[PDB]
Amino acid sequence: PTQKKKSKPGKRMRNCMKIENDCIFPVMLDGKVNGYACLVGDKVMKPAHVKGTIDNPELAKLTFKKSSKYDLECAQVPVCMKSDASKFTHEKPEGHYNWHHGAVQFSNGRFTIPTGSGKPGDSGRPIFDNTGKVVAIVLGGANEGARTALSVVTWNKDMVTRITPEESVEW
Amino acid sequence: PTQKKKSKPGKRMRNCMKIENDCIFPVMLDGKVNGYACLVGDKVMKPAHVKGTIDNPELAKLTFKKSSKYDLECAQVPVCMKSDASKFTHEKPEGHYNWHHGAVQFSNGRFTIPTGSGKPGDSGRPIFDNTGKVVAIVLGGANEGARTALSVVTWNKDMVTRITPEESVEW
């Protein structure tokens, strides 16, 4: 083409370029990482497949009010804690292309990655935008032999939590 | 001889430490290491100075039913795990020349090693063969003068409980 300015990166010597979250916290049961937690929205949309493994005991006892008609926990936590985790949600932008892997399409009410990318121990990872807003949580999936369908709880601006496939397993 | 005229070819890392192969796991009682466990037999035989056994957090909670009359434990874990532990016993093969340090001397019908057992937790170290198979558990010892003769409980085909050289010193 013809270029009359340069404003692309191209003057950097940077050690890091890492986007994948590290604002997460592993959560223990029998000394094994049985999931990954973070504190995303105004009332915290996490424990839902990672409520059976607990978080920490001190935390477990305070938080837990739930809607077990959805098998979801919600209840706010201090603003200081949320600052040192993930950020709140209040919308659904489609900036998400990161979760673990390089492309989750949202179409037809299911998040899909290619088949055989999805495997166990990927349960609890958030699907994150570029700003770190979590629009949906991976609870499990099923190999469909073309795609891997992902199971999620959501909380957006239209919600509809527990938007899941009808032949998914909870790993 | 048939096959190679050397045991093994050039490697920078040996599969073994010398001839021993470590696989032992510490077992706690009031914060202190009063033994080691590593699953021997048919219904499991370690405690003789300990109560409670730790080889994995998942296993410990699952296993514990007991017959408190010698301190006998009952339970059997998955076969994958069991292989990696110690081998069963009912019979006496000859090979025992390790329990800790691999130069255990056979003299006067007894196995003795030089001092170096005066630290706690030499009351539940196993006596394993050259490759390994545990017929018996080191219960204690007695100093002959600068050396330690060993007291043992066994479950081979020679029976006898509480083999004393002089007395049985539990550290």
Distances, alpha carbon A53 to alpha carbons A33, A50, A57, B81, in Å = 9, 5, 11, 24
Bridge partners (DSSP) of residue B147 are B114
Chain A residues contacting B via beta carbons under 8 Å = 30-32
Catalytic residue check, B96: no
Catalytic residue of the set A86, A123, A151, A168: A123
Residue of A nearest to B58 (CA): A30
Show residues of chain A in contact with B58, CB under 8 Å. 30, 32
Catalytic residue check, B101: no
Distance CA A29, CA A57 (A): 11
Distance CA A146, CA A144 (A): 5
Residue B68 φ/ψ region, left for φ over 0, alpha for ψ in the -120 to 50 degree band, beta for the rest = beta
Distance CA A72, CA A155 (A): 11
Distance CA A51, CA A40 (A): 15
Residue of A nearest to B57 (CA): A30
Catalytic residue check, A84: no
- From the number of C-beta atoms within 10 Å of its C-beta (0-12, 13-18, 19+), residue B33 rates as middle
Structural element, H or E, at residue B67: strand B65-67
- Method of elucidation: cryo-EM
Amino acid at B129: D
Distances, alpha carbon A141 to alpha carbons A69, A80, A104, A148, in Å = 20, 33, 13, 7
